[PDB]
Protein backbone atom coordinates (compact mmCIF):
# COMPACT_ATOMS: atom_id res chain seq x y z
CA UNK A 1 0.00 0.00 0.00
CA UNK A 2 1.12 3.59 0.11
CA UNK A 3 4.22 4.55 3.00
CA UNK A 4 2.67 5.48 6.17
CA UNK A 5 5.36 7.78 8.65
CA UNK A 6 4.20 6.23 11.91
CA UNK A 7 3.87 2.69 13.29
CA UNK A 8 2.53 2.21 16.76
CA UNK A 9 3.03 -1.73 18.26
CA UNK A 10 0.78 -2.70 21.26
CA UNK A 11 2.19 -6.04 23.22
CA UNK A 12 2.47 -7.37 26.80
CA UNK A 13 5.49 -8.25 27.96
CA UNK A 14 7.30 -10.80 26.32
CA UNK A 15 5.07 -10.67 23.46
CA UNK A 16 7.30 -10.60 20.30
CA UNK A 17 6.14 -7.17 19.70
CA UNK A 18 10.37 -5.87 19.64
CA UNK A 19 10.98 -8.66 16.92
CA UNK A 20 7.60 -7.40 15.04
CA UNK A 21 9.30 -4.21 15.00
CA UNK A 22 12.64 -4.93 13.92
CA UNK A 23 11.32 -7.24 10.78
CA UNK A 24 8.63 -4.28 9.91
CA UNK A 25 12.28 -1.67 10.30
CA UNK A 26 14.07 -4.72 8.49
CA UNK A 27 11.79 -4.98 5.58
CA UNK A 28 11.47 -1.22 4.61
CA UNK A 29 14.63 -0.19 2.50
CA UNK A 30 15.39 2.74 5.11
CA UNK A 31 18.64 3.79 7.45
CA UNK A 32 17.71 1.93 10.99
CA UNK A 33 18.18 3.86 14.28
CA UNK A 34 17.17 1.69 17.57
CA UNK A 35 16.11 4.85 19.98
CA UNK A 36 17.35 3.27 23.43
CA UNK A 37 15.05 3.98 26.52
CA UNK A 38 16.21 0.98 28.79
CA UNK A 39 18.52 2.05 31.76
CA UNK A 40 20.77 -0.47 32.76
CA UNK A 41 19.93 -4.67 36.90
CA UNK A 42 20.65 -7.70 35.57
CA UNK A 43 17.65 -8.20 33.97
CA UNK A 44 17.55 -5.53 32.05
CA UNK A 45 21.47 -6.05 31.24
CA UNK A 46 19.93 -9.33 29.91
CA UNK A 47 17.06 -8.11 27.80
CA UNK A 48 19.79 -5.26 26.31
CA UNK A 49 22.00 -8.13 25.69
CA UNK A 50 19.13 -10.40 24.40
CA UNK A 51 17.92 -7.23 21.71
CA UNK A 52 21.49 -6.49 20.79
CA UNK A 53 22.61 -9.77 19.90
CA UNK A 54 20.03 -9.73 17.35
CA UNK A 55 20.53 -6.80 15.75
CA UNK A 56 23.15 -6.73 12.67
CA UNK A 57 25.76 -4.01 11.74
CA UNK A 58 22.67 -2.14 9.70
CA UNK A 59 21.25 -0.90 12.85
CA UNK A 60 22.73 2.52 14.75
CA UNK A 61 21.75 2.89 18.29
CA UNK A 62 21.32 6.36 19.77
CA UNK A 63 20.02 6.53 23.87
CA UNK A 64 17.01 8.75 25.23
CA UNK A 65 16.39 7.47 28.22
CA UNK A 66 14.25 10.94 29.39
CA UNK A 67 14.14 13.38 26.25
CA UNK A 68 12.37 10.82 23.54
CA UNK A 69 10.56 13.58 22.03
CA UNK A 70 13.31 16.11 21.52
CA UNK A 71 15.25 12.92 20.15
CA UNK A 72 12.72 12.05 17.67
CA UNK A 73 12.40 15.24 16.54
CA UNK A 74 16.23 15.68 15.82
CA UNK A 75 16.82 12.46 14.31
CA UNK A 76 13.89 11.87 12.08
CA UNK A 77 14.25 12.06 8.43
CA UNK A 78 12.73 10.29 5.20
CA UNK A 79 15.91 8.24 4.53
CA UNK A 80 15.84 6.79 8.00
CA UNK A 81 13.43 4.35 10.52
CA UNK A 82 13.31 5.27 13.71
CA UNK A 83 12.30 2.17 16.20
CA UNK A 84 12.00 3.43 20.02
CA UNK A 85 13.34 0.32 22.05
CA UNK A 86 10.25 0.94 24.68
CA UNK A 87 7.76 3.78 25.25
CA UNK A 88 7.20 1.70 28.48
CA UNK A 89 10.74 2.43 29.76
CA UNK A 90 11.07 5.70 29.24
CA UNK A 91 7.71 6.35 30.85
CA UNK A 92 9.24 4.03 33.56
CA UNK A 93 12.78 6.54 33.97
CA UNK A 94 10.35 9.66 33.67
CA UNK A 95 7.89 8.30 36.71
CA UNK A 96 10.60 6.93 38.88
CA UNK A 97 12.87 10.93 38.64
CA UNK A 98 9.28 12.24 39.75
CA UNK A 99 8.47 13.61 36.51
CA UNK A 100 4.59 14.59 35.99
CA UNK A 101 4.02 12.52 32.90
CA UNK A 102 1.08 14.61 31.08
CA UNK A 103 3.15 16.84 29.43
CA UNK A 104 5.89 14.56 28.06
CA UNK A 105 2.85 12.26 26.70
CA UNK A 106 1.26 15.01 25.56
CA UNK A 107 4.64 16.54 23.79
CA UNK A 108 5.38 12.94 22.22
CA UNK A 109 1.91 12.17 20.53
CA UNK A 110 1.86 15.87 19.29
CA UNK A 111 5.81 15.08 18.09
CA UNK A 112 4.46 11.43 16.85
CA UNK A 113 1.54 13.11 14.87
CA UNK A 114 4.09 15.95 12.77
CA UNK A 115 6.96 13.32 12.07
CA UNK A 116 8.79 14.01 8.84
CA UNK A 117 10.38 10.67 9.15
CA UNK A 118 8.97 7.26 10.03
CA UNK A 119 9.16 5.85 13.35
CA UNK A 120 8.15 2.53 15.35
CA UNK A 121 6.34 2.86 18.75
CA UNK A 122 6.97 -0.33 20.74
CA UNK A 123 4.82 0.00 23.58
CA UNK A 124 3.01 -2.20 26.86
CA UNK A 125 -0.20 -3.01 27.07
CA UNK A 126 0.03 -2.69 31.14
CA UNK A 127 -4.09 -2.19 31.85
CA UNK A 128 -5.63 -5.80 31.52
CA UNK A 129 -4.98 -7.10 34.91
CA UNK A 130 -6.16 -6.26 38.85
CA UNK A 131 -5.60 -2.76 40.12
CA UNK A 132 -2.02 -2.28 41.58
CA UNK A 133 -1.84 -2.23 45.73
CA UNK A 134 0.51 0.60 45.56
CA UNK A 135 -0.29 4.29 44.78
CA UNK A 136 2.80 4.85 42.30
CA UNK A 137 2.45 1.67 40.42
CA UNK A 138 -1.63 2.97 39.56
CA UNK A 139 -0.46 6.00 38.71
CA UNK A 140 2.06 4.63 36.28
CA UNK A 141 -0.87 1.86 34.56
CA UNK A 142 -3.18 4.85 34.65
CA UNK A 143 -0.16 6.60 32.32
CA UNK A 144 0.66 3.67 30.47
CA UNK A 145 -2.74 3.70 29.13
CA UNK A 146 -3.31 7.35 28.79
CA UNK A 147 0.13 7.12 26.44
CA UNK A 148 -1.10 4.34 24.66
CA UNK A 149 -4.52 5.99 23.52
CA UNK A 150 -2.72 9.52 22.47
CA UNK A 151 -0.40 7.81 20.47
CA UNK A 152 -2.29 5.83 19.04
CA UNK A 153 -4.59 8.77 17.41
CA UNK A 154 -1.68 10.09 16.54
CA UNK A 155 -0.05 7.22 14.39
CA UNK A 156 -0.93 6.27 10.78
CA UNK A 157 -0.89 2.58 11.71
CA UNK A 158 -1.63 0.78 15.09
CA UNK A 159 -0.66 -3.49 15.25
CA UNK A 160 -1.46 -5.31 18.37
CA UNK A 161 1.14 -8.29 18.92
CA UNK A 162 -0.10 -11.81 20.90
CA UNK A 163 1.85 -14.37 21.19
CA UNK A 164 4.29 -13.10 18.39
CA UNK A 165 1.13 -12.65 16.09
CA UNK A 166 0.64 -9.40 14.57
CA UNK A 167 -3.17 -7.76 14.43
CA UNK A 168 -3.46 -4.55 12.39
CA UNK A 169 -6.62 -2.51 14.17
CA UNK A 170 -5.98 0.99 12.60
CA UNK A 171 -6.35 1.96 9.51
CA UNK A 172 -9.77 0.16 10.14
CA UNK A 173 -13.76 2.03 10.36
CA UNK A 174 -14.85 2.18 13.99
CA UNK A 175 -17.66 0.01 14.64
CA UNK A 176 -21.01 1.66 14.19
CA UNK A 177 -24.36 0.42 15.84
CA UNK A 178 -28.04 1.26 15.33
CA UNK A 179 -29.81 0.93 18.86
CA UNK B 1 -29.50 -3.98 12.15
CA UNK B 2 -31.10 -2.39 15.44
CA UNK B 3 -29.14 -3.95 18.31
CA UNK B 4 -30.82 -3.89 22.35
CA UNK B 5 -27.26 -4.63 23.66
CA UNK B 6 -23.43 -4.02 23.62
CA UNK B 7 -20.40 -5.49 25.94
CA UNK B 8 -17.41 -2.29 26.10
CA UNK B 9 -14.20 -4.77 27.33
CA UNK B 10 -11.21 -3.24 27.79
CA UNK B 11 -7.94 -2.46 30.70
CA UNK B 12 -7.59 0.32 32.64
CA UNK B 13 -7.71 3.65 30.81
CA UNK B 14 -8.21 1.52 27.34
CA UNK B 15 -10.45 4.52 26.05
CA UNK B 16 -13.78 2.26 26.64
CA UNK B 17 -15.59 4.63 29.00
CA UNK B 18 -15.08 7.48 26.31
CA UNK B 19 -15.94 5.02 23.52
CA UNK B 20 -19.43 4.21 25.43
CA UNK B 21 -20.36 7.19 25.99
CA UNK B 22 -19.06 8.66 22.05
CA UNK B 23 -21.60 5.36 20.95
CA UNK B 24 -25.08 7.25 22.71
CA UNK B 25 -24.20 10.64 21.64
CA UNK B 26 -24.46 8.93 18.02
CA UNK B 27 -27.25 7.04 18.22
CA UNK B 28 -29.91 9.96 18.76
CA UNK B 29 -31.58 8.52 21.74
CA UNK B 30 -32.14 10.18 25.47
CA UNK B 31 -28.51 9.24 26.59
CA UNK B 32 -28.52 8.16 30.78
CA UNK B 33 -25.46 7.25 32.84
CA UNK B 34 -25.80 4.13 35.45
CA UNK B 35 -23.29 4.60 38.71
CA UNK B 36 -22.18 1.47 40.71
CA UNK B 37 -26.62 18.18 30.27
CA UNK B 38 -28.36 15.31 27.88
CA UNK B 39 -27.58 12.98 30.49
CA UNK B 40 -29.49 11.61 33.56
CA UNK B 41 -27.85 10.17 36.21
CA UNK B 42 -28.85 7.03 38.23
CA UNK B 43 -27.18 5.30 41.10
CA UNK B 44 -27.13 1.13 42.00
CA UNK B 45 -24.54 0.33 44.19
CA UNK B 46 -26.48 -3.29 44.93
CA UNK B 47 -29.86 -3.84 42.95
CA UNK B 48 -28.36 -3.36 39.47
CA UNK B 49 -30.74 -5.88 37.80
CA UNK B 50 -33.69 -4.93 39.53
CA UNK B 51 -32.18 -1.23 38.35
CA UNK B 52 -31.94 -1.78 34.41
CA UNK B 53 -35.48 -3.31 34.15
CA UNK B 54 -37.14 -0.54 36.10
CA UNK B 55 -34.97 2.31 34.61
CA UNK B 56 -35.14 1.10 30.68
CA UNK B 57 -37.53 2.71 28.47
CA UNK B 58 -37.74 1.92 24.25
CA UNK B 59 -36.33 5.57 24.08
CA UNK B 60 -33.94 5.42 27.10
CA UNK B 61 -30.32 4.37 26.37
CA UNK B 62 -28.79 3.12 29.68
CA UNK B 63 -25.17 3.02 30.16
CA UNK B 64 -23.61 0.94 32.83
CA UNK B 65 -20.11 3.22 34.13
CA UNK B 66 -18.81 -0.22 35.64
CA UNK B 67 -19.80 -3.50 35.59
CA UNK B 68 -16.25 -3.95 37.79
CA UNK B 69 -17.39 -2.03 40.77
CA UNK B 70 -21.21 -3.32 41.06
CA UNK B 71 -19.22 -6.65 41.07
CA UNK B 72 -17.22 -5.03 43.94
CA UNK B 73 -19.46 -4.31 45.91
CA UNK B 74 -21.23 -8.00 46.41
CA UNK B 75 -17.53 -9.29 46.79
CA UNK B 76 -17.09 -6.95 50.22
CA UNK B 77 -20.75 -8.02 51.57
CA UNK B 78 -19.45 -11.65 50.86
CA UNK B 79 -21.94 -12.36 48.68
CA UNK B 80 -22.14 -15.84 46.61
CA UNK B 81 -21.70 -14.12 43.09
CA UNK B 82 -22.92 -16.82 40.86
CA UNK B 83 -26.94 -16.51 40.97
CA UNK B 84 -26.38 -12.21 40.91
CA UNK B 85 -23.91 -12.88 37.88
CA UNK B 86 -26.77 -15.38 36.03
CA UNK B 87 -29.92 -12.95 37.08
CA UNK B 88 -28.09 -9.39 34.84
CA UNK B 89 -27.29 -11.86 32.06
CA UNK B 90 -30.97 -12.85 31.86
CA UNK B 91 -31.30 -9.25 32.59
CA UNK B 92 -29.87 -8.21 29.37
CA UNK B 93 -31.65 -9.80 26.87
CA UNK B 94 -35.20 -8.82 28.79
CA UNK B 95 -34.62 -4.73 28.79
CA UNK B 96 -37.47 -2.72 27.97
CA UNK B 97 -35.15 -1.17 26.01
CA UNK B 98 -31.13 -0.23 24.58
CA UNK B 99 -28.03 -0.76 27.04
CA UNK B 100 -24.37 -0.69 26.84
CA UNK B 101 -22.47 -2.29 29.74
CA UNK B 102 -18.63 -0.84 30.07
CA UNK B 103 -16.27 -3.79 31.76
CA UNK B 104 -12.84 -3.86 32.50
CA UNK B 105 -10.32 -7.20 31.31
CA UNK B 106 -8.41 -7.99 34.24
CA UNK B 107 -7.35 -11.72 33.97
CA UNK B 108 -4.60 -10.73 31.13
CA UNK B 109 -1.58 -10.59 34.37
CA UNK B 110 -0.14 -13.03 36.68
CA UNK B 111 -2.29 -15.06 39.63
CA UNK B 112 -2.48 -12.40 42.51
CA UNK B 113 -0.97 -13.51 45.89
CA UNK B 114 -4.01 -12.06 48.09
CA UNK B 115 -7.74 -14.31 48.17
CA UNK B 116 -9.79 -11.22 47.57
CA UNK B 117 -7.92 -10.13 44.31
CA UNK B 118 -7.90 -14.09 42.80
CA UNK B 119 -11.58 -13.92 44.00
CA UNK B 120 -12.67 -10.92 41.85
CA UNK B 121 -10.15 -11.74 39.06
CA UNK B 122 -12.82 -15.05 38.45
CA UNK B 123 -15.96 -13.84 38.82
CA UNK B 124 -15.24 -10.58 36.76
CA UNK B 125 -13.92 -13.06 33.81
CA UNK B 126 -16.77 -15.03 34.59
CA UNK B 127 -19.06 -11.82 34.70
CA UNK B 128 -17.72 -10.78 31.49
CA UNK B 129 -18.07 -14.09 29.22
CA UNK B 130 -22.28 -14.43 30.51
CA UNK B 131 -22.53 -10.49 29.59
CA UNK B 132 -20.99 -11.40 26.38
CA UNK B 133 -23.24 -14.35 25.40
CA UNK B 134 -26.23 -12.39 26.79
CA UNK B 135 -25.45 -9.15 24.54
CA UNK B 136 -26.10 -8.65 20.94
CA UNK B 137 -22.86 -6.70 20.31
CA UNK B 138 -19.29 -6.74 21.94
CA UNK B 139 -16.26 -4.82 21.11
CA UNK B 140 -12.65 -4.55 22.29
CA UNK B 141 -11.07 -1.43 23.03
CA UNK B 142 -7.57 -1.08 22.84
CA UNK B 143 -5.13 1.86 23.09
CA UNK B 144 -8.54 3.90 22.42
CA UNK B 145 -9.41 2.01 19.40
CA UNK B 146 -12.44 -0.08 19.10
CA UNK B 147 -12.61 -3.70 17.29
CA UNK B 148 -16.08 -5.59 17.17
CA UNK B 149 -15.87 -9.50 18.09
CA UNK B 150 -19.48 -10.00 17.90
CA UNK B 151 -21.79 -10.47 15.79
CA UNK B 152 -19.71 -11.88 13.66
CA UNK B 153 -19.17 -15.57 12.84
CA UNK B 154 -16.64 -17.68 15.55
CA UNK B 155 -13.80 -19.36 13.86
CA UNK B 156 -14.03 -23.42 13.63
CA UNK B 157 -11.28 -26.06 13.25
CA UNK B 158 -11.42 -29.39 12.13
CA UNK B 159 -9.63 -32.46 12.99
CA UNK C 1 -5.57 -26.12 2.20
CA UNK C 2 -9.37 -24.57 3.04
CA UNK C 3 -9.76 -23.61 6.28
CA UNK C 4 -12.37 -26.69 6.99
CA UNK C 5 -9.12 -29.35 5.97
CA UNK C 6 -8.05 -30.90 9.24
CA UNK C 7 -5.23 -29.79 10.76
CA UNK C 8 -3.08 -31.02 13.60
CA UNK C 9 -2.56 -28.58 16.45
CA UNK C 10 -4.67 -25.25 17.17
CA UNK C 11 -3.26 -23.15 20.22
CA UNK C 12 -5.97 -21.41 22.29
CA UNK C 13 -4.62 -17.57 24.57
CA UNK C 14 -6.88 -16.36 27.22
CA UNK C 15 -6.72 -14.43 30.12
CA UNK C 16 -8.03 -16.24 33.38
CA UNK C 17 -11.40 -17.38 33.08
CA UNK C 18 -11.37 -16.31 29.63
CA UNK C 19 -13.45 -18.88 27.89
CA UNK C 20 -10.59 -20.57 26.84
CA UNK C 21 -10.90 -24.11 27.98
CA UNK C 22 -14.61 -24.05 26.88
CA UNK C 23 -13.62 -22.91 23.82
CA UNK C 24 -11.19 -25.85 23.14
CA UNK C 25 -13.72 -28.02 24.84
CA UNK C 26 -16.24 -27.15 22.02
CA UNK C 27 -13.69 -27.49 19.31
CA UNK C 28 -12.95 -30.98 20.51
CA UNK C 29 -16.37 -32.27 20.76
CA UNK C 30 -17.37 -31.33 16.99
CA UNK C 31 -14.50 -33.95 16.29
CA UNK C 32 -15.19 -37.44 15.77
CA UNK C 33 -11.98 -38.40 17.81
CA UNK C 34 -11.62 -39.88 20.90
CA UNK C 35 -10.95 -37.07 23.53
CA UNK C 36 -8.20 -37.35 25.79
CA UNK C 37 -7.94 -34.91 28.64
CA UNK C 38 -4.01 -33.87 29.05
CA UNK C 39 -4.11 -32.64 33.15
CA UNK C 40 -1.52 -29.97 34.21
CA UNK C 41 -3.61 -28.82 37.25
CA UNK C 42 -2.13 -30.32 40.94
CA UNK C 43 -4.85 -29.67 43.29
CA UNK C 44 -2.90 -27.66 45.66
CA UNK C 45 -5.67 -26.09 47.35
CA UNK C 46 -9.13 -25.40 47.93
CA UNK C 47 -8.97 -23.24 44.64
CA UNK C 48 -7.33 -25.62 42.66
CA UNK C 49 -9.52 -28.34 43.72
CA UNK C 50 -12.45 -25.66 42.44
CA UNK C 51 -11.32 -25.33 39.35
CA UNK C 52 -10.90 -28.96 39.14
CA UNK C 53 -13.98 -30.09 39.76
CA UNK C 54 -15.69 -27.25 37.42
CA UNK C 55 -13.47 -28.60 34.68
CA UNK C 56 -14.62 -32.61 35.01
CA UNK C 57 -18.35 -31.47 35.93
CA UNK C 58 -17.98 -29.79 32.15
CA UNK C 59 -17.28 -32.75 30.31
CA UNK C 60 -19.58 -35.60 29.79
CA UNK C 61 -18.08 -39.22 29.76
CA UNK C 62 -17.09 -38.96 26.11
CA UNK C 63 -13.43 -37.61 27.44
CA UNK C 64 -10.57 -40.17 29.10
CA UNK C 65 -8.22 -38.02 31.24
CA UNK C 66 -4.09 -38.63 31.69
CA UNK C 67 -2.38 -36.56 34.57
CA UNK C 68 1.02 -34.71 33.31
CA UNK C 69 1.82 -32.60 36.01
CA UNK C 70 5.55 -32.03 34.45
CA UNK C 71 6.40 -34.60 31.70
CA UNK C 72 3.87 -32.93 29.42
CA UNK C 73 6.02 -32.95 25.77
CA UNK C 74 6.66 -36.87 26.75
CA UNK C 75 3.03 -37.52 27.07
CA UNK C 76 2.74 -36.30 24.13
CA UNK C 77 4.89 -38.04 22.05
CA UNK C 78 3.50 -41.32 23.93
CA UNK C 79 -0.53 -40.58 23.71
CA UNK C 80 -1.09 -38.62 20.62
CA UNK C 81 -2.73 -41.20 18.15
CA UNK C 82 -4.37 -40.25 14.21
CA UNK C 83 -7.75 -41.50 15.90
CA UNK C 84 -7.29 -39.24 18.79
CA UNK C 85 -7.71 -35.87 20.13
CA UNK C 86 -5.76 -34.50 22.87
CA UNK C 87 -5.84 -31.33 25.36
CA UNK C 88 -3.38 -29.74 27.19
CA UNK C 89 -5.82 -28.27 30.38
CA UNK C 90 -3.13 -25.62 30.54
CA UNK C 91 -0.01 -24.91 29.67
CA UNK C 92 0.31 -22.31 32.24
CA UNK C 93 -0.17 -24.51 35.16
CA UNK C 94 2.49 -27.17 33.49
CA UNK C 95 4.72 -24.07 33.53
CA UNK C 96 3.78 -23.14 37.20
CA UNK C 97 4.57 -26.90 38.15
CA UNK C 98 7.94 -26.83 36.65
CA UNK C 99 8.28 -23.25 38.28
CA UNK C 100 7.96 -24.92 42.19
CA UNK C 101 9.98 -27.70 41.33
CA UNK C 102 12.76 -25.75 40.10
CA UNK C 103 13.46 -26.80 36.43
CA UNK C 104 14.90 -24.21 33.71
CA UNK C 105 12.01 -23.47 32.17
CA UNK C 106 13.57 -23.08 28.26
CA UNK C 107 14.44 -26.23 27.65
CA UNK C 108 11.14 -28.22 28.40
CA UNK C 109 9.50 -24.98 26.74
CA UNK C 110 11.58 -25.90 23.33
CA UNK C 111 10.87 -29.35 23.44
CA UNK C 112 7.02 -28.67 23.72
CA UNK C 113 7.26 -26.26 20.47
CA UNK C 114 9.09 -28.82 18.45
CA UNK C 115 6.82 -31.92 19.40
CA UNK C 116 4.27 -29.58 18.39
CA UNK C 117 5.45 -30.12 15.01
CA UNK C 118 5.58 -33.76 14.71
CA UNK C 119 3.00 -35.68 17.17
CA UNK C 120 1.55 -38.46 15.66
CA UNK C 121 -2.38 -37.34 15.89
CA UNK C 122 -4.08 -33.37 16.45
CA UNK C 123 -3.54 -31.29 19.69
CA UNK C 124 -5.13 -28.17 21.49
CA UNK C 125 -2.94 -26.29 23.88
CA UNK C 126 -4.79 -24.50 25.77
CA UNK C 127 -2.76 -21.13 27.49
CA UNK C 128 -2.69 -18.27 29.46
CA UNK C 129 -1.88 -14.67 28.57
CA UNK C 130 0.24 -13.25 31.64
CA UNK C 131 1.74 -10.34 29.88
CA UNK C 132 -0.51 -7.58 29.79
CA UNK C 133 -0.29 -6.38 33.70
CA UNK C 134 2.57 -4.07 35.14
CA UNK C 135 5.99 -5.48 35.88
CA UNK C 136 5.65 -7.75 38.98
CA UNK C 137 7.48 -7.25 42.51
CA UNK C 138 9.12 -10.29 43.11
CA UNK C 139 11.34 -12.23 40.84
CA UNK C 140 9.90 -15.55 40.47
CA UNK C 141 6.61 -13.99 39.51
CA UNK C 142 8.89 -11.96 36.75
CA UNK C 143 10.75 -15.37 35.42
CA UNK C 144 7.33 -16.96 35.14
CA UNK C 145 5.69 -13.72 33.15
CA UNK C 146 8.56 -14.12 30.65
CA UNK C 147 8.91 -17.94 30.40
CA UNK C 148 4.85 -17.78 29.75
CA UNK C 149 5.23 -15.29 26.80
CA UNK C 150 8.42 -16.79 25.07
CA UNK C 151 6.08 -20.61 25.64
CA UNK C 152 3.14 -18.56 24.05
CA UNK C 153 5.53 -17.22 21.50
CA UNK C 154 7.05 -20.60 20.20
CA UNK C 155 3.60 -22.88 20.59
CA UNK C 156 2.27 -20.13 18.22
CA UNK C 157 4.50 -20.04 15.29
CA UNK C 158 4.77 -24.06 15.86
CA UNK C 159 0.76 -24.35 15.28
CA UNK C 160 -1.45 -24.65 12.74
CA UNK C 161 -3.71 -22.36 14.06
CA UNK C 162 -4.36 -19.64 16.88
CA UNK C 163 -7.29 -17.99 18.55
CA UNK C 164 -7.54 -15.34 21.34
CA UNK C 165 -10.41 -16.06 23.72
CA UNK C 166 -12.06 -12.66 25.06
CA UNK C 167 -15.29 -12.40 27.32
CA UNK C 168 -15.77 -16.07 26.20
CA UNK C 169 -15.50 -15.17 22.23
CA UNK C 170 -12.82 -16.68 20.35
CA UNK C 171 -11.08 -14.89 17.42
CA UNK C 172 -8.49 -16.16 15.04
CA UNK C 173 -5.13 -14.58 14.34
CA UNK C 174 -3.57 -18.02 12.58
CA UNK C 175 -3.60 -18.82 9.89
CA UNK C 176 -4.09 -14.87 8.41
CA UNK C 177 -1.89 -12.68 6.39
CA UNK C 178 0.35 -10.11 8.70
CA UNK C 179 0.33 -6.69 8.13
CA UNK C 180 2.66 -5.36 5.83
CA UNK C 181 3.87 -1.47 5.79
CA UNK C 182 5.73 0.67 3.37
CA UNK C 183 8.27 3.62 4.94
N1 LIG D 1 12.57 -6.30 36.02
C1 LIG D 1 12.09 -5.84 34.83
N2 LIG D 1 12.20 -6.61 33.71
C2 LIG D 1 11.72 -6.16 32.51
C3 LIG D 1 11.08 -4.82 32.46
N3 LIG D 1 10.69 -4.61 31.20
C4 LIG D 1 11.07 -5.71 30.48
N4 LIG D 1 11.67 -6.65 31.26
C5 LIG D 1 12.16 -8.00 30.85
O1 LIG D 1 12.18 -8.13 29.42
C6 LIG D 1 11.09 -9.05 29.05
C7 LIG D 1 10.43 -8.54 27.77
O2 LIG D 1 11.44 -8.75 26.79
P1 LIG D 1 11.16 -8.14 25.33
O3 LIG D 1 12.10 -8.84 24.36
O4 LIG D 1 11.25 -6.69 25.67
O5 LIG D 1 9.68 -8.56 25.03
P2 LIG D 1 8.80 -8.34 23.71
O6 LIG D 1 9.40 -7.19 22.91
O7 LIG D 1 7.43 -8.07 24.29
O8 LIG D 1 8.91 -9.72 23.06
C8 LIG D 1 10.15 -9.26 30.25
O9 LIG D 1 9.44 -10.56 30.30
C9 LIG D 1 11.19 -9.08 31.37
O10 LIG D 1 11.89 -10.31 31.55
C10 LIG D 1 11.04 -4.05 33.72
O11 LIG D 1 10.53 -2.91 33.78
N5 LIG D 1 11.54 -4.61 34.82
N1 LIG E 1 -5.16 -20.05 43.15
C1 LIG E 1 -5.05 -20.30 41.84
N2 LIG E 1 -6.20 -20.26 41.09
C2 LIG E 1 -6.13 -20.47 39.77
C3 LIG E 1 -4.84 -20.78 39.13
N3 LIG E 1 -5.07 -20.99 37.82
C4 LIG E 1 -6.41 -20.82 37.64
N4 LIG E 1 -7.04 -20.57 38.81
C5 LIG E 1 -8.46 -20.30 39.05
O1 LIG E 1 -9.30 -20.82 38.00
C6 LIG E 1 -9.89 -19.74 37.29
C7 LIG E 1 -9.81 -20.08 35.81
O2 LIG E 1 -10.74 -21.08 35.47
P1 LIG E 1 -10.59 -21.73 33.97
O3 LIG E 1 -11.80 -22.64 33.80
O4 LIG E 1 -9.27 -22.36 33.78
O5 LIG E 1 -10.78 -20.50 33.02
P2 LIG E 1 -10.86 -20.33 31.37
O6 LIG E 1 -10.39 -21.64 30.80
O7 LIG E 1 -9.92 -19.18 31.25
O8 LIG E 1 -12.29 -19.96 31.23
C8 LIG E 1 -9.09 -18.48 37.64
O9 LIG E 1 -9.90 -17.28 37.57
C9 LIG E 1 -8.66 -18.79 39.06
O10 LIG E 1 -9.77 -18.51 39.92
C10 LIG E 1 -3.66 -20.80 40.02
O11 LIG E 1 -2.55 -21.06 39.54
N5 LIG E 1 -3.84 -20.54 41.32
Given at each position: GDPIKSLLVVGGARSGKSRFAQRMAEASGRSLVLIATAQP???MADRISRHAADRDARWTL??????????LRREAQ???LLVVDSVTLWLSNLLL???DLSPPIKDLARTAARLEGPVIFVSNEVGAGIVPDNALARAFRDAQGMCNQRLAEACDAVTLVTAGIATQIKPGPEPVFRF
Open positions: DAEIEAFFDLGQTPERRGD
